[PDB]
Write an enzyme that holds these catalytic residues in place. Structure first.
Site, PDB file in Angstrom:
ATOM      1  N   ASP A 121      -1.299  -1.274   5.650  1.00 41.31           N
ATOM      2  CA  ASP A 121      -2.523  -1.733   6.297  1.00 41.31           C
ATOM      3  C   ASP A 121      -2.811  -3.203   5.998  1.00 41.31           C
ATOM      4  OD1 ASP A 121      -2.965  -1.107   3.729  1.00 41.31           O
ATOM      5  OD2 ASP A 121      -4.753   0.167   4.032  1.00 41.31           O
ATOM      6  N   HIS A 122      -1.914  -3.878   5.291  1.00 42.74           N
ATOM      7  CA  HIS A 122      -1.929  -5.331   5.181  1.00 42.74           C
ATOM      8  C   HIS A 122      -0.702  -5.901   5.870  1.00 42.74           C
ATOM      9  CE1 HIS A 122      -4.947  -5.786   1.759  1.00 42.74           C
ATOM     10  NE2 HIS A 122      -4.723  -4.479   1.789  1.00 42.74           N
ATOM     11  N   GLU A 175      -0.129  -3.255  -4.841  1.00 40.48           N
ATOM     12  CA  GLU A 175      -0.447  -1.840  -4.585  1.00 40.48           C
ATOM     13  C   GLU A 175       0.825  -1.036  -4.325  1.00 40.48           C
ATOM     14  OE1 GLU A 175      -3.657  -1.376  -1.849  1.00 40.48           O
ATOM     15  OE2 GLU A 175      -4.156   0.649  -2.585  1.00 40.48           O
ATOM     16  N   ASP A 193      -3.593 -10.078  -3.029  1.00 36.20           N
ATOM     17  CA  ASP A 193      -4.754  -9.450  -2.418  1.00 36.20           C
ATOM     18  C   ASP A 193      -5.914  -9.728  -3.349  1.00 36.20           C
ATOM     19  OD1 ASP A 193      -6.794  -7.753  -1.511  1.00 36.20           O
ATOM     20  OD2 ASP A 193      -5.472  -6.034  -1.188  1.00 36.20           O
ATOM     21  N   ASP A 230      -5.776 -11.517   1.779  1.00 36.67           N
ATOM     22  CA  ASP A 230      -4.595 -11.952   1.067  1.00 36.67           C
ATOM     23  C   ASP A 230      -4.474 -13.470   1.216  1.00 36.67           C
ATOM     24  OD1 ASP A 230      -3.176  -9.148   0.547  1.00 36.67           O
ATOM     25  OD2 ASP A 230      -4.120  -9.095   2.552  1.00 36.67           O
ATOM     26  N   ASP A 282       0.816  -1.215   0.000  1.00 37.26           N
ATOM     27  CA  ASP A 282       0.000   0.000   0.000  1.00 37.26           C
ATOM     28  C   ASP A 282       0.857   1.276   0.000  1.00 37.26           C
ATOM     29  OD1 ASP A 282      -2.207   1.524  -0.134  1.00 37.26           O
ATOM     30  OD2 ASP A 282      -3.319   0.526   1.475  1.00 37.26           O
ATOM     31  N   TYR A 290      -3.257  -8.179  -7.667  1.00 42.32           N
ATOM     32  CA  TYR A 290      -3.956  -7.184  -6.864  1.00 42.32           C
ATOM     33  C   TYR A 290      -5.327  -7.019  -7.519  1.00 42.32           C
ATOM     34  CZ  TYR A 290      -5.239  -2.587  -5.011  1.00 42.32           C
ATOM     35  OH  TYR A 290      -5.899  -1.550  -4.399  1.00 42.32           O
ATOM     36  N   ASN A 330      -9.042  -9.271  -2.502  1.00 38.44           N
ATOM     37  CA  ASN A 330     -10.051  -8.231  -2.268  1.00 38.44           C
ATOM     38  C   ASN A 330     -11.449  -8.825  -2.061  1.00 38.44           C
ATOM     39  OD1 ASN A 330      -9.602  -5.463  -1.793  1.00 38.44           O
ATOM     40  ND2 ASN A 330      -8.621  -5.240  -3.802  1.00 38.44           N
TER      41      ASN A 330
END
Ligand SMILES: [Ca+2]
Ligand code: NA
Ligand code: NA
Length: 276
Positions: A266-267, A54, A168, A241, A28, A129, A170
């Site tokens: 934030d992951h 990301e 990720d 993830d 991120d 991603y 999502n």
DNA sequence: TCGACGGATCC
DNA sequence: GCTGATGCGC
DNA sequence: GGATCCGTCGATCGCATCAGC
């Protein structure tokens, strides 16, 4: 409730030692993640392959630290074609892959720098991603189209070589995969469409969720927490993830880990061990 | 994610 | 380089 | 008619852009 990942199991279901260690991490903001000492953590984890999502970082702006960094010297990057500072993935490997390609072969879906495909001797690795369904579900229609194209692509690949998909995705597949299932059934990542697409993915390819296959009733295990409301300190998170494997690789599977304490995004990162 | 608003609907 | 605003994201 | 409830509906954090100079 807080969560403590069990210790690393490094032998296969037949006692073969793990030969391959893959780490995957939505950073991120690659430059920000490096400033927050992500590479120190990577150096200590010492993966054979490292997948990042990301990155939000063009090939021009990749910081200098990333070259000075074996045993991850073979590095590949993909950025969107016309959208700076958005999305972006990378793949860094100790040994050079036989062949590398970008995207899935569908022009509609190959513009946002989301997919790298790396083929090795015994298997193919895909890192992805997946596009967010968006606030207000603005991109949910697009997400479903992506889901079908991605599934079709992965089914093809897996018909030629054993497949590892990481990254990720999502979506939180089931209610054990996030902290607040009730309040999120109409939010990105837990709509019935996204959960259904994940289920179709597992069946149509087919693939297995490595972590859930090994810990099928382990709750409160998450890979993401929003920066807001101090969610991570409360472990109010989502498991977004994954490592998904061809069924043939399940006897190679040694462990699938969640590195809950590694900071910088934030992951948190996830780690796959394979005996190959 | 959280609290704050609502506007119900029960005791 | 710097301010201020916008895009994106579960 | 005061108290709990239940579908919204805004303010948070963090990164990196853009517009302008
Ligand atoms: Ca937006
Ligand atoms: Na009563
Ligand atoms: Na009265």
């Amino acid at each position: 409730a807080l969560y403590e990942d069990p210790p690393d199991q490094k032998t296969s279901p037949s006692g073969k030692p793990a030969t391959l260690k893959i780490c995957s991490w939505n950073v991120d903001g690659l430059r920000a993640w490096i400033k927050k000492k992500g590479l120190d953590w990577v150096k200590e984890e010492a993966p054979d392959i490292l997948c990042l999502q990301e990155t939000k970082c063009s090939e021009n702006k990749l910081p200098a630290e990333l070259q000075e960094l074996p045993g991850l010297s073979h590095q590949y990057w993909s950025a969107p074609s016309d959208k700076e500072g958005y999305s972006g993935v990378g793949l860094l490997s100790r040994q050079a892959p036989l062949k590398v390609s970008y995207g899935i072969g569908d022009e509609e879906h190959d513009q946002e720098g989301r997919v790298i495909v790396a083929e090795f001797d015994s298997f193919v690795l895909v890192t992805a991603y997946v596009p967010n369904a968006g606030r207000g579900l603005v991109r949910l229609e697009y997400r479903q189209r992506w889901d079908e194209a991605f599934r079709k692509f992965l089914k093809g690949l897996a018909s030629r070589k054993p497949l590892v998909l990481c990254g990720d995705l999502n979506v939180a597949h089931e209610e054990i995969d996030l902290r607040n299932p009730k309040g999120n059934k109409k939010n990105a990542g837990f709509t019935p469409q996204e959960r259904q697409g994940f289920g179709e993915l597992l069946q149509a390819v087919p693939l297995a969720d490595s972590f859930r296959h090994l810990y099928p009733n382990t709750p409160y295990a998450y890979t993401f927490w929003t920066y807001m409301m101090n969610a991570r300190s409360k472990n109010v998170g989502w498991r977004l993830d994954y490592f998904l494997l061809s069924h043939s690789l399940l006897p190679a599977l040694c462990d699938s880990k969640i590195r809950s304490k590694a900071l910088g995004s934030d992951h948190c990162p996830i780690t796959l061990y394979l005996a190959l």
